[PDB]
Amino acid sequence: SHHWGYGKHNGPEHWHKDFPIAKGERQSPVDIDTHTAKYDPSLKPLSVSYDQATSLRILNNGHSFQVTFDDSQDKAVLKGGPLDGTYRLLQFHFHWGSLDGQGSEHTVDKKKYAAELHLVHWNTKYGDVDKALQQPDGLAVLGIFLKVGSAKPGLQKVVDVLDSIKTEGKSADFTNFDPRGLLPESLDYWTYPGSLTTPPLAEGVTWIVLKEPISVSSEQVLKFRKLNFNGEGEPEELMVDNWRPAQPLKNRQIKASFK
Numbered sequence: 001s002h003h004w005g006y007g008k009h010n011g012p013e014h015w016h017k018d019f020p021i022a023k024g025e026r027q028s029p030v031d032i033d034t035h036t037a038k039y040d041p042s043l044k045p046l047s048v049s050y051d052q053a054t055s056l057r058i059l060n061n062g063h064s065f066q067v068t069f070d071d072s073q074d075k076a077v078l079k080g081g082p083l084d085g086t087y088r089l090l091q092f093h094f095h096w097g098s099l100d101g102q103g104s105e106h107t108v109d110k111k112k113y114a115a116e117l118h119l120v121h122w123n124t125k126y127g128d129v130d131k132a133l134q135q136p137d138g139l140a141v142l143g144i145f146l147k148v149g150s151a152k153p154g155l156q157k158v159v160d161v162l163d164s165i166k167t168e169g170k171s172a173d174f175t176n177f178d179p180r181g182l183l184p185e186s187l188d189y190w191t192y193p194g195s196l197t198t199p200p201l202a203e204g205v206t207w208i209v210l211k212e213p214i215s216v217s218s219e220q221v222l223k224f225r226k227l228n229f230n231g232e233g234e235p236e237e238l239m240v241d242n243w244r245p246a247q248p249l250k251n252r253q254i255k256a257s258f259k
Ligand SMILES: NS(=O)(=O)c1ccc(NC(=O)Nc2cnn(-c3ccc(S(N)(=O)=O)cc3)c2-c2ccccc2)cc1
Pocket: 056, 061, 066, 068, 069, 070, 071, 072, 090, 091, 118, 120, 129, 133, 141, 195, 196, 197, 198
C-alpha cells in the first residue's frame, strides 16, 4: 500500500510532489513515433532466454498484479540488443484500461493498446535489484502490447488465479509458469533510455518495446478489470486504468531493431 495511485487525487499528475524526478529528463512511458525512430544496424541480436525460468508467487500489490521469479541465479535472462551484459528476470506485471481502447503506457504513433505487459529485469553486474535501481543502466524492461482479439493460451493460467488475489496484499503460489507463452512471434523492437513508470520513477531503465502485440480475448482482459486497488473490506474501487500517460521525450532518440 502507498499514498500514490491512479485516481484524481493521487494519480500521475500528483506524483512529482513526492517524487520530483517525475519531471526528469528520461521519464517513461513515451509515445513511439515510428517515423522518427532510427533503424540502428549496430544493435546486436536480442536474446530472450527463459527456458529455465522459475516462477514463485502471484501478488496483488495495490497498483498491478505481478508474477515473481527466482532471480538468485541466471535462470531467465535477457541479453543482446542494446544491452551490455546479462539481465535477470525478477517479475512481470501488467497495465490495462477500463475500455479496450486504452490501457497501455507506451503508445505507437499515439495509438493506445488495451494493455501492456512489462517483464522486469536487472543488470547482474550490480549484484542485487536494490543496487541496480540506483544505476543508469540498472534495469531492462521488455514491454509487450496487448490487443483484444483471439485468446492467448499462455495467459490463461494467470487469468484463472486472479479471483484468488482480488485485493491488495493477497498472494498465491504460482509455480511452473512459463513466460515464453506470453511472447509474440517476432522480437523486432524499439529501444530508448527511460525510467520506471511507477514511483520511485527511477531513471535506470533500458526500455525494449516489441513491435508485434499479442492478442488476448475480451474474456481475458475482463478478468483483469475485476481486480481491486483496495485491500479487503475497504470501499470497492476497480483496478482499471493503472497506466501512466506518455511523458516528454526531451533529448532522447528511439532506435529500431528493424527497417
Ligand atoms: N525474486 S523475488 O525475491 O521473489 C522478488 C521479486 C520481486 C520483488 N519486488 C518487486 O517486484 N517490486 C516492485 C513492484 N512493482 N515494481 C515495478 C514497478 C513498475 C515497473 S515498470 N512499469 O516496468 O516501469 C517495474 C517494476 C517493482 C520493482 C522491481 C524491481 C525494481 C523496481 C521496482 C521482490 C522480490
